[PDB]
Symmetry: C2
Subunit: 122 residues, 2 copies
């Protein structure tokens, strides 16, 4: 059992755009799981995965797929802008995002990235 890897998680609750929001980040070997929940809802699940290999002069293209919940164009844009930096800083691991945020704005998204940053596990 020597060298079993630890599954690492960190959470914070913060008021974001006036609304109480809990963020949890959990690091697996292939994925970072990012959970952003308002009003106790699990929300929509979005898979974000690199679809090209990184180089010295390029970041991987990220493809998004809604796995559960409301599949709307805005959620793909929102997920990508929310957690692209997580994938890129975590060795180009994929991200599994559970996001329950009713009122999406660039304001809330930038505030949420800061909370994610506080909950870094990569």
């Amino acid at each position: 059992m020597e060298d079993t890897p630890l599954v690492i998680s960190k959470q914070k609750t913060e008021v974001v755009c006036g609304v109480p929001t809990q963020v949890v980040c959990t690091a697996f070997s292939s994925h970072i799981l990012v959970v952003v929940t308002q009003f106790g809802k699990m929300g929509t699940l979005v898979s974000l995965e690199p679809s090209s290999v990184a180089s010295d002069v390029s970041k991987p293209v990220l493809t998004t797929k809604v796995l559960l919940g409301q599949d709307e164009p805005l959620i793909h844009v929102f997920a990508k802008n929310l957690v692209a930096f997580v994938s890129q800083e975590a060795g180009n691991r994929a991200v599994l995002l559970a996001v329950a945020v009713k009122d999406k704005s660039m304001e809330g998204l930038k505030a949420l990235r800061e909370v994610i940053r506080v909950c870094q596990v990569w």
Copy 2:
């Protein structure tokens, strides 16, 4: 607002059939998220929810969908056996299971269920 949880989560690490296993259970308004991880992997993502044709078996038969990972028959039977009781007890909430178990066994399955019990959030 304090830095305190909005949703309840319980976790436990246990050696199961010789393999250190991390279990985390989190309760959402309409879902229970259960993570069962060995060897640092996120594993297969499986949604489980009470069938709509499923009437008066006091436990509905469950509909299972692999959302991420290998979609093959055995992981569906494993998921049902592992967490049917979660859904039944949780107010028939849906279950989203992330499961990475290297060697499935009757012994292992039963022991895993006891760890999930220790993480009861419903």
